[PDB]
Structure formats: structure tokens, C-alpha cells
Design a binder for this molecule. Structure first.
Ligand SMILES: O=C(O)/C=C/c1ccc(O)c(O)c1
Ligand SMILES: [Zn+2]
Length: 257
């Protein structure tokens, strides 16, 4: 199957998922000088106070912290969005070195990692139906740079040993995702896609301008995870990021002047 290796990595995905060469693929490079401020963009509304996390799972490509999305608990609205989007899970993409790891880039700059808070449009009823729609998902992207530790990330770092290999999961209740947000909600937004197969073109991307800082020790722990399952040759889970894709006929809008 697909992955991030030399023989099954991003350059190969188009053979099983032709949409990989589509008109609105993600990630993209955000050219800060070309992005245009859009004064009509409403401020983002991130309501995570009633968030209910459930479990953390190593799925062989990244680890996902899953939330109960059977009710309007944790929701994203406003900004470029029409309607209410419910948080279903968050995950990260990271590198084998601090100089790479993010999927979106800013003026070609690569960050050490990137957090994706995934939300689906409640007008579509469930996640599976939402990914089949052009405005089905809203993903909040947050860059991570290596520096000071992020306290709100430590509980995730400490449970990683329990989900080292593909297919392993662990209880992960009472985790507050608000601890992963930067101070400012200034953002860039554009229409795009899932960045892993099936690469569906169903995402309104909202990428925050302000990165969060995490420590070298925190990201080092991410790099101890495994892509393989237990009892299989160890392949470290590093560089699970897709590189920037052609912008094509799209404009990236900024919420700030
Ligand atoms: O196939 C699915 O069921 C979900 C895929 C998925 C979900 C969230 C992402 O950011 C992404 O790249 C892919
Ligand atoms: Zn992602």
C-alpha cells in the first residue's frame, strides 16, 4: 500500500489515486507576498470547551487523537466557513530532522512539524459523507517549531510509548486541544484536499500564521514511533509529510493585513 518510503511515497500515489494530480491538491507553499488580505473574512470561531477526546491510535502513517463527534461539542465556525464543522480528530506530520516535517510551507520555509485539527461539515451528517463534498471538511493547520516545550502537548508525548506500532491504540480521555493553539488566530485560507490518500478535494484549509513552539525532547519522542506493526522490522515513523503541490487556479487569502 501507499506510504512515505522510496517505493511507495508521495511520488507514487497518483497510480492508485489519480486525483493526486488534481486541480486543488494540498499542501501548497504559502507565498506571503502573493496572498491577499480579504477584509470580508470573519474572525475564526474555535469552540473547544466541551471537547471530548476518546482515544489515540497509531494508524501506520501518523497517530490520531480521536474525539466524540456524535454531538456539537468541539466545533469550528466563522472565518471562510459557512456552517458548523465538528472536530473528529487531530494528528501531526513531522520530519526526521528539525529542518523539515511540515506539509504547508511559508515562502518555501519548512517547519519541524504540522498539526492538523480535522473537522467535518455537520450539514452532511457524518465524516464519510462529508469527504465526498467540496466543502465537506475544514482542517486547521498549525506549524510547530523547535524551541521551548509546549506544556499542552506533553500528555500526548507521554502516551506514545503505549502506541509505538501500527494498529495500537490507547485510551486518551480528557485531553484539551485548546492547549495546542497559538495566541493569535490570524490565518491563511484556500480550497484544497486531504494530504494523504484518498487525497479527496473536500477541504477548506485554514493555516494559522503563528506557529507553536515544542521542545527538541517532545519532537524526538514523535520520531521514536514506528510505521510498522509489532513483530515486524522497525521502520521509524519520520518524514510522514507530503511536499507542496502546484497551486494551479487558486488564490490564498489572508485574514490579516
Ligand atoms: O480516509 C479517511 O477516512 C480519512 C483520511 C484523512 C483524514 C484527515 C486527513 O488530514 C487526511 O489527510 C486524510
Ligand atoms: Zn494531516
Amino acid at each position: 500500500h501507499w506510504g512515505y518510503g522510496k517505493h511507495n511515497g508521495p511520488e507514487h500515489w497518483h497510480k492508485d489515486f489519480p486525483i493526486a494530480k488534481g486541480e486543488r491538491q494540498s499542501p501548497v507553499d504559502i507565498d506571503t507576498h502573493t496572498a491577499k488580505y480579504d477584509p470580508s473574512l470573519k474572525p475564526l470561531s474555535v469552540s473547544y470547551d466541551q471537547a471530548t477526546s476518546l482515544r489515540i491510535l497509531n494508524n501506520g502513517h501518523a497517530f490520531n487523537v480521536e474525539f466524540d463527534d456524535s454531538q456539537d461539542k468541539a466545533v469550528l465556525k466563522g472565518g471562510p466557513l459557512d456552517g458548523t464543522y465538528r472536530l473528529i480528530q487531530f494528528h501531526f506530520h513531522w520530519g526526521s530532522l528539525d529542518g523539515q516535517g511540515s506539509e504547508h510551507t511559508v515562502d518555501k520555509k519548512k517547519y519541524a512539524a504540522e498539526l492538523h485539527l480535522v473537522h467535518w461539515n455537520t450539514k452532511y451528517g457524518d465524516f464519510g459523507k462529508a469527504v465526498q463534498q467540496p466543502d465537506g471538511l475544514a482542517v486547521l493547520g498549525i506549524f510547530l517549531k523547535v524551541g521551548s516545550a509546549k506544556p499542552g502537548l506533553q500528555k500526548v508525548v507521554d502516551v506514545l510509548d503505549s502506541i509505538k506500532t501500527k494498529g495500537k491504540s490507547a485510551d486518551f480521555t480528557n485531553f484539551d486541544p485548546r492547549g495546542l493553539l497559538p495566541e493569535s488566530l490570524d490565518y491563511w485560507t484556500y480550497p484544497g484536499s486531504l494530504t494523504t490518500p484518498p487525497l479527496l478535494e473536500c477541504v477548506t484549509w485554514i493555516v494559522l500564521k503563528e506557529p507553536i513552539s515544542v521542545s527538541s525532547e517532545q519532537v524526538l519522542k514523535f520520531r521514536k514511533l514506528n510505521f510498522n506493526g509489532e513483530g515486524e522490522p522497525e521502520e521509524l515513523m519520520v518524514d510522514n509529510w507530503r511536499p507542496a503541490q502546484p497551486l494551479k487556479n487558486r488564490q490564498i487569502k489572508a485574514s490579516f493585513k
